[PDB]
Design a binder for this molecule. Structure first.
Ligand SMILES: *[C@@H]1O[C@H](CO)[C@@H](O[C@@H]2O[C@H](CO)[C@@H](O[C@@H]3O[C@H](CO[C@H]4O[C@H](CO)[C@@H](O)[C@H](O)[C@@H]4O)[C@@H](O)[C@H](O[C@H]4O[C@H](CO)[C@@H](O)[C@H](O)[C@@H]4O)[C@@H]3O)[C@H](O)[C@H]2NC(C)=O)[C@H](O)[C@H]1NC(C)=O
Ligand SMILES: *[C@@H]1O[C@H](CO)[C@@H](O[C@@H]2O[C@H](CO)[C@@H](O)[C@H](O)[C@H]2NC(C)=O)[C@H](O)[C@H]1NC(C)=O
Ligand SMILES: *[C@@H]1O[C@H](CO)[C@@H](O[C@@H]2O[C@H](CO)[C@@H](O)[C@H](O)[C@H]2NC(C)=O)[C@H](O)[C@H]1NC(C)=O
Ligand SMILES: *[C@@H]1O[C@H](CO)[C@@H](O[C@@H]2O[C@H](CO)[C@@H](O)[C@H](O)[C@H]2NC(C)=O)[C@H](O)[C@H]1NC(C)=O
Ligand SMILES: *[C@@H]1O[C@H](CO)[C@@H](O[C@@H]2O[C@H](CO)[C@@H](O)[C@H](O)[C@H]2NC(C)=O)[C@H](O)[C@H]1NC(C)=O
Ligand SMILES: *[C@@H]1O[C@H](CO)[C@@H](O[C@@H]2O[C@H](CO)[C@@H](O)[C@H](O)[C@H]2NC(C)=O)[C@H](O)[C@H]1NC(C)=O
Ligand SMILES: *[C@@H]1O[C@H](CO)[C@@H](O[C@@H]2O[C@H](CO)[C@@H](O)[C@H](O)[C@H]2NC(C)=O)[C@H](O)[C@H]1NC(C)=O
Ligand SMILES: *[C@@H]1O[C@H](CO)[C@@H](O[C@@H]2O[C@H](CO)[C@@H](O)[C@H](O)[C@H]2NC(C)=O)[C@H](O)[C@H]1NC(C)=O
Ligand SMILES: *[C@@H]1O[C@H](CO)[C@@H](O[C@@H]2O[C@H](CO)[C@@H](O)[C@H](O)[C@H]2NC(C)=O)[C@H](O)[C@H]1NC(C)=O
Ligand SMILES: *[C@@H]1O[C@H](CO)[C@@H](O)[C@H](O)[C@H]1NC(C)=O
Ligand SMILES: *[C@@H]1O[C@H](CO)[C@@H](O)[C@H](O)[C@H]1NC(C)=O
Ligand SMILES: *[C@@H]1O[C@H](CO)[C@@H](O)[C@H](O)[C@H]1NC(C)=O
Ligand SMILES: *[C@@H]1O[C@H](CO)[C@@H](O)[C@H](O)[C@H]1NC(C)=O
Ligand SMILES: *[C@@H]1O[C@H](CO)[C@@H](O)[C@H](O)[C@H]1NC(C)=O
Ligand SMILES: *[C@@H]1O[C@H](CO)[C@@H](O)[C@H](O)[C@H]1NC(C)=O
Ligand SMILES: *[C@@H]1O[C@H](CO)[C@@H](O)[C@H](O)[C@H]1NC(C)=O
Ligand SMILES: *[C@@H]1O[C@H](CO)[C@@H](O)[C@H](O)[C@H]1NC(C)=O
Ligand SMILES: *[C@@H]1O[C@H](CO)[C@@H](O)[C@H](O)[C@H]1NC(C)=O
Ligand SMILES: *[C@@H]1O[C@H](CO)[C@@H](O)[C@H](O)[C@H]1NC(C)=O
Ligand SMILES: *[C@@H]1O[C@H](CO)[C@@H](O)[C@H](O)[C@H]1NC(C)=O
Ligand SMILES: *[C@@H]1O[C@H](CO)[C@@H](O)[C@H](O)[C@H]1NC(C)=O
Ligand SMILES: *[C@@H]1O[C@H](CO)[C@@H](O)[C@H](O)[C@H]1NC(C)=O
Ligand SMILES: *[C@@H]1O[C@H](CO)[C@@H](O)[C@H](O)[C@H]1NC(C)=O
Lengths: 411, 243, 214, 357, 54
């Protein structure tokens, strides 16, 4: 009613004949938003025990650390040079947000109480409000989305679900992830400092790249801004339709009644009413399509959280280009930003592989676990090693299967 | 800001100080660049967009406007109260900066005035010599006429003025009422007389134009020609020109 | 809950009805375009010929023909977009059947919120309704876990299967248990891998365990 | 219509509202002062008088008939009185008429009475304006009237209104061009901190004018993308005034056929609701005694509304957390289990439609 | 400009009033293509050692 009829008591009366059109428009938008809020609310959750240790300040302390880890002064000390720009900070502007989040939101860019102050010239948002167009918060607003990502990050170092908040070092959590990639056998030569340094530096360059407004960063900034620009244009396009005369003497309802007597003025208005309702119908159709497109995207966001952040996935190439170690996530305008931490090989080891072993009544022996490579070492002994990381293991009898024959490629 | 005056007209560049109204001089008088272009640092004080529309146009627009200066004649001084200008046989001898030898399409008069003064400055009459020879005169009156000429004030006026085209001293047409402030008068070869950018009167092509001043009336007179340019306009007043 | 017209049931009813209402509105919108005169004297073809002679009546009709063809073109475009949207949804339906109904999936969170046991499915207007039967924990058991075992020339022992947790029981013996359900298994030698070193988090082995551990 | 709940019913064309949120105006206005801001220029006013002399007569039956042979008089200008032009900055136009009658054709020496009686009315014919509205602040570059249908834009229909019927006798032609030189006037005052019907620099609307301290306006006025006036400058002082609506959209929460509460951006009582609280984006008025813990009946956004008007906000679902792949120290493994069944719907196909073109 | 105004010097002048409309149209298409090229380029790769025996 406000969009089509601009508070004019005499226009609203004419608009009575089109009440069913307005109800269709308003209900269609309301139903779209309602369905979205339900499936979004299903996706989001928090964990108080995880939130308690999710902050930078929590990580930089020993207060929550499980006493069994006395060798560690804090949670993820060696990894904190990177995590500090990912985890939310208490000592900051806008409550609990991370350094990257602030850069991503402020480089891209609702209170309506202020639109009635009248102490300045209204901005675009209030100017839209006056035309019946207003933006509402939904379920996944920025504060709730931030809690969601913080709870996920804080889960990595939470030692138990029994109750309370007992933490483990980040380095311990990471070592656990390395074992899924390949069983780690080289216990006397820890590479945690190397991995931690590479991580901290990578984040340093990412945070800097956002602040500077790195191919991945450029891609994200372009995509994030585009989502924002599109919604902006959709509403700017709608408001300028009010300037369309639609073959009337004027686009202004009060101007028509100011210049022309009611028996003729009503006819001029009827054309504007028809025109403006048409514009709203086009808007609604366009809006509903965008929601359908997002639905598909959301399913991907949900799968990424469940398979990259909350668990280790066996799907090659799903959680970044490389061998996945862990993922962290933060808030972004209208969605999430994912940080996929992956292993990148710098050198390859050559070994001479054995197809199998022919032993002696003769029989063949093959390796039970098909993911392992059998090879012979310099001391002439057999070793097994996974193909994702060179972590050689002495071979034993429990690793082999007897078969009747032998191939030509058997040793 | 400190104001210095530089004059290299005799082949040697000479530097001296300026008093009078230096700020006004830098806001109204510019040196013409080769090709007749106006310097990018000229503020365009009292240079209005020439339009036929009755309304107020603002924004960035590309139009054909008399922004090429064949000769700029600063702070003109006349032998008598009256003077004559021609679109064809005109002679350029007091051009500030480069002079371009071509036919003049528009003669633009940048009027000298001060805000809120209502000083005794203005023209008694503007006389337009059309093709055939018919002399049409423009003069404005304190009240509505029902041979005495009238007065066209420069700058701020004390009240309404009713403008007529005269012939044989007998009013031939009523043109309208002058704006509260007359800042620019521009007359085209093609018979169009503009006030502050608005086409006030139109007739047959003009061979020559003359006028009689009451009792330094102008900041400058620019002899210009039409070109295509991108102009930034605020209230029909030009703020920036890109040719 | 369905008979009553449970958050999951309410969500399904809203979504199912919305799919149906949308198609209904698409066709209702199309039929009412026939009432649009499109600047003709009338929307009714027989009314135009009943009132007006052919040489002029044809012109009135030409405007209605142009208008109605335009409405059909808009309908077709709108319809094709909906089909594209469904195509993406269908792929999900297909993946759900293959990974939740016809087989056990290893994808965490894919087949419902919890630990997936089995799925059944039924028909629904324009699609399928899935019943994901999942396990929900009601109580947690605390155990004291061992990072690994340091045994004796010394060597380390780690668990070959990284999905299992090693812990020591009340009888001082070692057990392995998966982390999705507390189903403890006595540990044996075939479950361990020898490594050169020991961590600080490893437990010290005793001779009495070695016969079963290594 | 007579009550706030019934006004919602009238707007929606229903006699039975459903639980939910309905759009309402925060307030309604009328009977307010008029405010105008004109371009200063100079006062120069012309009064324009049109006299219509109607020659009414009678028929055999008695059906009163006006005579195309009627006379319209425009003021005197340039001797001819067939075309009168306005040559002043402001003007007012008034129409007057004299009704004369006859028994004999074309004598008109007798006053018309009773059923013969008529009054002249000038009504819109083809012009994008009514004759009687020319006394409002309408603006023209030029405006001139003509009884001659030559080189003229639109025409007015001049009719005789009787106690029986009304018919057109003559046409009055008007020459005009749009502009800001000539302004209609009834026979530069604005009212601040009040709801007013304004006409500012050619912009008409209803709103509240407020004096502000800013330098934002470069021209006389600034507008929104929709064309609405957001503010303007006084030519003499440079002082800026802002313009806002007298009312804004508000959401009325209706439960069981009654208004329970409403959200608005204006901190003013609406819909009979006197108690209120403040939310992050709006003010909330309700029946609830505000200067909570309840189950909402209706919701939208992240807001729920309870039967008693209490306003509740929706929390994010909690969980214990995920089991981590940690094998050091005291860890937890789920032991006791029950079964839950989760239900979801996925669309597989569309319903194909065949249309015979 | 070419689609709307067919190289006609006199039409292009009128079209000046709609420059912002043309810029919106051209920029919208350019941005769409730009985003697509980035994510497509991310997907594609080659390996010379594999091509040699492919
Ligand atoms: C994915 O699936 C998981 C299930 O595996 C869901 O997680 C469960 O969510 C519910 C709802 O929040 C949790 O229940 C809550 O437990 C809190 C703590 O437990 C106390 O109470 C129990 C009672 O049995 C005691 O045994 C226990 O020792 C504690 O004393 C309670 O405080 C919560 O109370 C809330 O609800 C009640 C009833 O309405 C109100 O009266 C309270 O004021 C308060 O609002 C509540 O009972 C449950 O524990 C979670 N289980 C697990 C394993 O996580 C996830 O939510 C679901 N994910 C999504 C997105 O839906
Ligand atoms: C971006 O990453 C590079 C790593 O390739 C960082 O360069 C290193 O700087 C550190 C000191 O901070 C040195 O110890 C390394 O030797 C450098 N390695 C090089 C040059 O390859 C670089 O500082 C990072 N940038 C930011 C902003 O963090
Ligand atoms: C992995 O990196 C290490 C270095 O950290 C490499 O070890 C070096 O090997 C070269 C011979 O290739 C020796 O000359 C160096 O003295 C070694 N440096 C050491 C032991 O740190 C190792 O070879 C690399 N692996 C592969 C497959 O290239
Ligand atoms: C412009 O004015 C300045 C003063 O502001 C003049 O400066 C004088 O210069 C002479 C040398 O030529 C000195 O002896 C005087 O002492 C200076 N005056 C002051 C007050 O310092 C300057 O000469 C003037 N310009 C010209 C061309 O005369
Ligand atoms: C106002 O309109 C007149 C036409 O009535 C324009 O006059 C033309 O000017 C061009 C020069 O650019 C000549 O080539 C034409 O022959 C003139 N036409 C006539 C009938 O004389 C005038 O230029 C317009 N002025 C403005 C500011 O737009
Ligand atoms: C522009 O006009 C002003 C007057 O409005 C002129 O200033 C006067 O000039 C005369 C002659 O030199 C002096 O007697 C007056 O005292 C000056 N008046 C004021 C207020 O200063 C000025 O000379 C003119 N300038 C140009 C460039 O024509
Ligand atoms: C799983 O549920 C069983 C009950 O079915 C719990 O067993 C009880 O344990 C408590 C002590 O915690 C005893 O007092 C009861 O007598 C037991 N009842 C039995 C044996 O049925 C069992 O503890 C629960 N598991 C966990 C980890 O809490
Ligand atoms: C625009 O500003 C002018 C002043 O610049 C206002 O006119 C004056 O109003 C005061 C009231 O205190 C009178 O005393 C003055 O006599 C008025 N005239 C002048 C020249 O000062 C004018 O009313 C303002 N217009 C609006 C619409 O606010
Ligand atoms: C795991 O939890 C058990 C309790 O279930 C802890 O054992 C207790 O430790 C305290 C000292 O803090 C003693 O006073 C109790 O007598 C112990 N109880 C029992 C039954 O032994 C155990 O220490 C915890 N282990 C770890 C690594 O945290
Ligand atoms: C951790 O605390 C120390 C003070 O003990 C401080 O110097 C250091 O900067 C803090 N680290 C982070 C990431 O805040
Ligand atoms: C293994 O040894 C036997 C005996 O010398 C020989 O015949 C056989 O070919 C050998 N296997 C392979 C793969 O060379
Ligand atoms: C130019 O004027 C200066 C200053 O009066 C003078 O010194 C110089 O000689 C003059 N140049 C010529 C060519 O006369
Ligand atoms: C204008 O000046 C000229 C030259 O002195 C004179 O002949 C003419 O009569 C004057 N006209 C008027 C109106 O003053
Ligand atoms: C107008 O110009 C013609 C050109 O021949 C000339 O004869 C006539 O005297 C002029 N009239 C003036 C300057 O008033
Ligand atoms: C009056 O106008 C006529 C035009 O035919 C002209 O010839 C005559 O000289 C004019 N009279 C005077 C006194 O200028
Ligand atoms: C295992 O026992 C040895 C011998 O007493 C001791 O030095 C070592 O620190 C113990 N290991 C751990 C993890 O405490
Ligand atoms: C109208 O203006 C008068 C002052 O002239 C003021 O007292 C009154 O309250 C105003 N009423 C409205 C509705 O603006
Ligand atoms: C218009 O008519 C009224 C009488 O109703 C008269 O007083 C007024 O002076 C007239 N105005 C003109 C311009 O004739
Ligand atoms: C109008 O005046 C005419 C003379 O032009 C006269 O004959 C006629 O009777 C009048 N008509 C009226 C007053 O209706
Ligand atoms: C109709 O006109 C005829 C001829 O003038 C006349 O004889 C007759 O009486 C009239 N009837 C009426 C006035 O109804
Ligand atoms: C405008 O005036 C008010 C009241 O004195 C003051 O609080 C506010 O800061 C001023 N704003 C500006 C921009 O001067
Ligand atoms: C509750 O209502 C009473 C009136 O009966 C009022 O005095 C009191 O202030 C109200 N409480 C609140 C919190 O507004
Ligand atoms: C949960 O709801 C309570 C009100 O019962 C509120 O105070 C609290 O901040 C909310 N917490 C979260 C995490 O949403």
């Amino acid at each position: 009613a406000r969009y089509v009829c601009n508070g004019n008591p005499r226009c609203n009366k004419l608009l009575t004949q089109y009440v069913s059109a307005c109800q269709t428009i308003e209900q269609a938008l309301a139903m779209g938003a309602r369905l979205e809020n339900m499936e979004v609310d299903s996706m989001l959750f928090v964990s108080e025990n995880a939130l308690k240790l999710a902050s930078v300040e929590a990580f930089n302390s020993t207060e929550n650390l499980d006493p069994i880890y006395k060798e560690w002064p804090n949670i993820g000390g060696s990894w904190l040079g990177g995590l500090k720009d990912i985890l939310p900070s208490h000592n900051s502007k806008r409550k609990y947000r991370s350094a990257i989040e602030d850069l991503l939101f402020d480089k891209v860019v609702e209170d309506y109480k202020r639109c009635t102050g009248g102490y300045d010239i209204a901005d675009l948002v209030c100017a839209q409000y006056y035309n019946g167009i207003m933006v509402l918060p939904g379920v996944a607003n920025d504060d709730k989305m931030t809690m969601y990502t913080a709870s996920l990050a804080g889960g990595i170092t939470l030692g138990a679900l029994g109750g309370g908040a007992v933490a483990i070092p980040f380095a311990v959590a990471v070592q656990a992830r390395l074992n899924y990639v390949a069983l780690q056998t080289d216990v006397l030569n820890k590479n945690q400092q190397i991995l931690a340094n590479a991580f901290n530096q990578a984040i340093g360059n990412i945070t800097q790249a956002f602040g500077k407004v790195l191919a991945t960063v450029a891609k994200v900034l372009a995509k994030v801004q585009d989502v924002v620009n599109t919604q902006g244009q959709a509403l700017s396009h709608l408001t300028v339709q009010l300037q369309n005369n639609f073959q009337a003497i004027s686009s202004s309802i009060s101007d028509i009644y100011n210049r022309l007597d009611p028996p003729s003025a009503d006819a001029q208005v009827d054309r504007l009413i028809t025109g403006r309702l048409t514009a709203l119908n086009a808007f609604v159709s366009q809006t509903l399509t965008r929601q359908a497109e997002v639905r598909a995207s959301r399913q991907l966001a949900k799968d990424k959280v469940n398979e990259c952040v909350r668990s280790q996935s066996q799907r090659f190439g799903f959680c970044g280009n490389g061998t996945h170690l862990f993922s962290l996530a933060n808030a972004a305008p209208n969605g999430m930003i994912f940080f996929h931490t992956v292993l990148l090989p710098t050198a390859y080891q050559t070994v001479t592989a054995c197809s199998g072993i022919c032993a002696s009544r003769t029989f063949g022996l093959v390796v039970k676990d098909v993911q392992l490579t059998l090879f012979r070492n310099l001391d002439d002994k057999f070793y097994l090693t996974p193909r994702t990381m060179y972590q050689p293991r002495a071979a034993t009898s429990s690793d082999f299967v007897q078969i009747e024959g032998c191939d030509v490629l058997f040793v | 800001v400190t104001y210095y005056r530089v004059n290299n007209k005799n082949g040697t560049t000479i530097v001296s100080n300026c008093t009078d109204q230096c700020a006004s001089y830098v806001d109204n008088v510019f040196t013409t660049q080769p090709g007749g272009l106006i310097p990018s640092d000229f503020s365009f004080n009292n240079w209005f967009l020439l339009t036929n529309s009755s309304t107020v146009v603002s924004g960035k627009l590309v139009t054909r406007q008399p922004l090429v200066v064949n000769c700029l004649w600063p702070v003109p001084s006349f032998k008598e109260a009256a003077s004559t200008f021609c679109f064809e046989g005109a002679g350029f001898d007091q051009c500030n900066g480069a002079v371009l030898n071509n036919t003049v399409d528009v003669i633009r008069f940048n009027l000298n005035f001060t805000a809120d003064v209502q000083s005794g400055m203005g023209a008694t009459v503007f006389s337009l010599n059309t093709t055939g020879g018919v002399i049409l005169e423009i003069s404005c009156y304190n009240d509505i006429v029902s041979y005495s000429y009238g007065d066209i004030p420069f700058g701020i006026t004390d009240g309404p003025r009713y403008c007529y085209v005269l012939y044989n001293g007998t009013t031939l047409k009523y043109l309208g009422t002058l704006p509260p402030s007359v800042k620019e008068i521009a007359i085209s070869k093609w018979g169009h007389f503009y006030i502050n950018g608005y086409n006030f009167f139109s007739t047959f092509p003009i061979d020559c134009i003359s006028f009689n001043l009451t009792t330094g009336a102008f900041w400058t007179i620019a002899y210009t020609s039409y070109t295509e340019a991108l102009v930034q306009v605020e209230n029909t007043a030009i703020k920036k020109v890109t040719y | 809950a369905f008979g009553k017209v449970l958050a999951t049931v309410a969500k399904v009813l809203a979504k199912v009805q919305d799919v149906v209402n949308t198609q209904g509105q698409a066709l209702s919108h199309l039929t009412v375009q026939l009432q649009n005169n499109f600047q003709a004297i009338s929307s009714s073809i027989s009314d135009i010929y009943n009132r007006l002679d052919p040489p002029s009546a044809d012109a009135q009709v030409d405007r209605l023909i142009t208008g109605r063809l335009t409405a059909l073109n808009a309908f077709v475009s709108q319809t094709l977009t909906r089909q594209a949207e469904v195509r993406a949804s269908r792929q999900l339906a297909k993946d759900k059947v293959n990974e939740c109904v016809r087989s056990q999936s290893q994808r965490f969170g894919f087949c419902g919120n919890g630990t997936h046991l089995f799925s059944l499915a039924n028909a629904a207007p324009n699609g399928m309704i899935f019943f994901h039967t999942v396990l929900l924990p009601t109580a947690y058991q605390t155990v004291t876990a061992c990072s690994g075992i340091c045994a004796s020339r010394t060597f380390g022992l780690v668990v070959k299967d990284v999905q299992l947790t090693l812990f020591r029981n009340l009888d001082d013996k070692f057990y392995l248990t998966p982390r999705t359900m507390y189903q403890p298994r006595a540990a044996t030698s075939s479950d361990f891998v020898q490594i050169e070193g020991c961590d600080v988090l490893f437990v010290n082995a005793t001779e009495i365990d070695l016969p079963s551990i290594i | 219509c007579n009550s706030h709940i019934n006004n919602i019913k009238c707007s929606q064309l229903t006699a039975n509202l459903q639980n939910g949120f309905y759009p309402v105006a925060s307030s309604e206005v009328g009977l307010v002062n008029k405010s105008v801001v004109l371009l200063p220029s100079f006062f120069a006013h012309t009064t324009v008088n049109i006299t219509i002399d109607l020659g009414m007569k009678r028929s055999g039956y008695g059906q009163p008939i006006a005579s195309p042979l009627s006379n319209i008089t425009l003021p005197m200008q340039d001797n001819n009185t067939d075309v009168y032009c306005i040559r002043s900055n402001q003007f007012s136009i008034y129409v007057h008429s004299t009704c004369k009658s006859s028994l004999w054709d074309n004598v008109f020496n007798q006053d018309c009475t009773d059923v013969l009686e008529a009054t002249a009315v000038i009504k819109t014919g083809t012009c994008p304006f009514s004759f009687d509205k020319l006394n409002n602040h309408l603006t023209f570059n030029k405006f001139c009237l003509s009884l001659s249908p030559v080189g003229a834009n639109c025409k007015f229909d001049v009719a005789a209104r009787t106690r029986t019927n009304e018919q057109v006798v003559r046409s009055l032609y008007v020459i005009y061009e749009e502009g800001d030189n000539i302004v209609g006037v009834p026979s530069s005052v604005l009212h601040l901190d009040s709801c007013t019907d304004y006409n500012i620099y050619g912009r008409t609307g209803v709103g509240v004018i407020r004096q502000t301290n800013s330098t934002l306006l470069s021209g006389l006025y600034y507008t929104s993308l929709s064309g609405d006036l957001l503010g303007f400058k006084n030519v003499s002082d440079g002082v800026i005034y802002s313009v806002t609506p007298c009312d804004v959209s508000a959401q009325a929460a209706v439960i069981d056929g009654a208004i329970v509460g409403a959200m608005t951006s204006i901190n003013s009582e609406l819909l009979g609701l006197t108690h209120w609280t403040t939310t992050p984006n709006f003010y909330y008025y309700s029946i609830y005694n505000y200067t909570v813990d309840c189950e909402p009946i209706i919701t939208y956004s992240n807001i729920g509304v309870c039967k008693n008007g209490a306003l509740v906000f929706i929390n994010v679902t909690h969980s214990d957390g995920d089991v981590q792949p940690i094998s050091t120290g005291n860890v937890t493994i789920p032991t006791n289990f029950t079964i839950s069944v989760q239900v979801e719907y996925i669309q597989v196909y569309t319903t194909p439609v065949s249309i015979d073109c």
